[PDB]
Structure 1
Amino acid sequence: QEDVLAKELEDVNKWGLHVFRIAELSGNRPLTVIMHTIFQERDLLKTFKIPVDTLITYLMTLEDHYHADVAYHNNIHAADVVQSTHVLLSTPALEAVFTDLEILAAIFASAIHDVDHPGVSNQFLINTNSELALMYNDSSVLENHHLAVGFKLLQEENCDIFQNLTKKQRQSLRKMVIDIVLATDMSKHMNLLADLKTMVETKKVTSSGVLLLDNYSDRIQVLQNMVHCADLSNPTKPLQLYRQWTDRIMEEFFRQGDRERERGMEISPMCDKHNASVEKSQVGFIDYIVHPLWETWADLVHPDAQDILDTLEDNREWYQSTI
């Protein structure tokens, strides 16, 4: 069974990796094995002097803190986001643009960006006076908690994968990771996209024809949008993957809808398993959120992402045609 997993992990650099198969083949360790493969692929263990055993122990603990009962926001989603971010980092327009530290930050951010997700929305947690919402004062509740658990786990025995970074490297990675994960909060999406359009309209490309990011604010904005695109990349994937993601998000949205009913609350949009248009929701999700974002990304890196964009638009057409 190990050589089968190893042959599937050969697709780790391709948009559309069979992540669910890898989840199966790995004994439900897609995050561990995909992160380890990506770290091996980018030589991050030699570069940052990460003991392999420390890397593995941290990854399995992190994966353990994704919930098995959560159909969408689980370790497979994390593995998927990790691997999609990895692909986007290698886009030719960003070639040589980012440092090893920033590359590490973006990959590590993707891995933790939904850890310990309970399966209910920020608004749900706010509207039910959840402990998490009280602790975090209703502000990017889930995303602050993902960050806190993601860092907390580095402190467990033989889990500090950053133990041979300088104090200054860890400070800079901590800030980048926090900035990246907070940007995955969807209430930040409009302003994020606005700033990405502005960067596109003021794009400078260097002599080599790659992107010029001369300051932290520009560099971190790209990583924020890169990971955000990766988080919203499901409708850009091959249809058999996309549809399974839709099934999973709907199961989870419906399971929040049931709990809202149990409490007599008003049912959130798209969470009522009695009045739900899965297909129309996906078309409006693409039309209003995913396609604007990804079209703007494709602009920033033109033409590197044209195949991703084509697939998104075929998939939009597909879901639409089913109505």
Structure 2
Amino acid sequence: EQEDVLAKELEDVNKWGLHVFRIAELSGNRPLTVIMHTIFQERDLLKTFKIPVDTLITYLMTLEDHYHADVAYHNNIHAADVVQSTHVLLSTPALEAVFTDLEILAAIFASAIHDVDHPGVSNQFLINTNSELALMYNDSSVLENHHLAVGFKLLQEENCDIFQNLTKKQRQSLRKMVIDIVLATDMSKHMNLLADLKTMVETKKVTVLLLDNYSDRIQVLQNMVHCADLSNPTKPLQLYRQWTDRIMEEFFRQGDRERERGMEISPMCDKHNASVEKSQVGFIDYIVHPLWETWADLVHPDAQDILDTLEDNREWYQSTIP
């Protein structure tokens, strides 16, 4: 009877503001797994890419296992969330039939792994602490590079290769795409990504959106997953505040070590100069709203509803200030 109620909630997989935490619990902490499975089913991807179902579950389960249950934000639930968000984003009327099946798969898949094996501290933290990871990747997109490496390496476990029936050309192309996307989730590439998104809205054409070259398509996709990645101030409030509590719990833990090692405690990593609300408003006025406002223009007027809520949410966090 608890698979019934989970089935009931999964009917919302096409809606923005899906109850993803309820889904987490109602599935035995298998949100990324059930949610990926429902999306592939809904989009017919198993049939299109001849992915055996046995193979699909194994893989998602192993992937999901490689999210850390003990980091509050960058876990399987967040992974589940971005995935589902990108999926809805994919479906916006203004993108109808712009993207191939294989382009679609990359964006969903990449969303699925974009933070796999995240340790719960930031790139900058890992660079500062001369960490084993940061030494590996020469201080450059340290974590993103990592999530990709892990996401790809898992395909190699017994009965995990969900790409086995793609052609060689298909595999090359999807590998590149997934790499180009996950790497674009590095928060220091934000300003440049967005500036590029702004030129594209500046010189866009319609028919529905028109793009005739890899580099225009991959950009849109990268920004789409960036949006999904940075999509939680745009969900209904009860959801977004839980996400805040969480990332904040993760940061405070970082700064407990940042203050412990004795570096200068990051900005907004100090549980004693917590300005949580002030920091969402700022995060929205300078990062999230500029971003979404822009995406909403590319797909005018499909994202209108998402942008409204965003502004209801901000106007709420502000109400909590003085």
Q: TM-score, normalised by structure 1?
A: 0.99
CA distance in 2, matches of 1:25, 1:172: 36
Shift of 1:240: 0.2
CA distance in 2, matches of 1:315, 1:142: 29
CA distance in 2, matches of 1:318, 1:40: 37
Q: Secondary structure at the match of 1:186?
A: coil
Shift of 1:262: 1.4
Shift of 1:62: 0.1
Shift of 1:265: 1.3
The sequence identity of aligned pairs, in percent, is 100
CA distance in 1, matches of 2:168, 2:147: 23
CA-to-aligned-CA distance 1:18-67 (integer Å, 9 cap, x gap): 00000000000000000000000000000000000100000000000000
CA distance in 2, matches of 1:152, 1:11: 32
CA-to-aligned-CA distance 1:130-154 (integer Å, 9 cap, x gap): 0000000000000000000000000
CA distance in 2, matches of 1:128, 1:262: 12
1:29 and 2:30 aligned: yes
1:273 and 2:289 aligned: no
CA distance in 2, matches of 1:244, 1:283: 16
CA distance in 1, matches of 2:154, 2:132: 20
CA distance in 2, matches of 1:287, 1:145: 30
Q: Secondary structure at the match of 2:211?
A: coil
CA distance in 2, matches of 1:171, 1:229: 25
CA-to-aligned-CA distance 1:139-192 (integer Å, 9 cap, x gap): 000000000000000000000000000011000000000000000000000000
Count of aligned pairs between the two proteins: 320
Equivalent residue, structure 1, for 2:177: 176
Shift of 1:295: 0.2
Q: Secondary structure at the match of 1:158?
A: coil
CA-to-aligned-CA distance 1:254-294 (integer Å, 9 cap, x gap): 00000111111110011010011000000000000000000
CA distance in 1, matches of 2:185, 2:283: 16
CA-to-aligned-CA distance 1:92-139 (integer Å, 9 cap, x gap): 000000000000000000000000000000000000000000000000
CA distance in 2, matches of 1:242, 1:185: 21
Mind listing any 5+ residue stretches in structure 2 that lack a counterpart? none
CA distance in 1, matches of 2:152, 2:71: 22
CA distance in 1, matches of 2:252, 2:211: 42
Shift of 1:233: 0.3
CA distance in 1, matches of 2:80, 2:236: 17
Shift of 1:322: 0.4
Equivalent residue, structure 2, for 1:151: 152
Q: Secondary structure at the match of 1:155?
A: coil
CA distance in 1, matches of 2:71, 2:83: 18
Equivalent residue, structure 2, for 1:13: 14
Q: Secondary structure at the match of 2:238?
A: helix
Equivalent residue, structure 2, for 1:51: 52
Equivalent residue, structure 2, for 1:286: 284
CA distance in 1, matches of 2:106, 2:189: 20
Equivalent residue, structure 1, for 2:83: 82
CA distance in 2, matches of 1:70, 1:53: 29
CA distance in 1, matches of 2:52, 2:257: 44
CA distance in 2, matches of 1:69, 1:259: 16
Shift of 1:247: 0.3
CA distance in 2, matches of 1:281, 1:264: 23
Equivalent residue, structure 1, for 2:197: 196
CA distance in 1, matches of 2:243, 2:186: 19
Q: Secondary structure at the match of 2:8?
A: helix
Equivalent residue, structure 1, for 2:214: 216
CA distance in 1, matches of 2:241, 2:18: 15
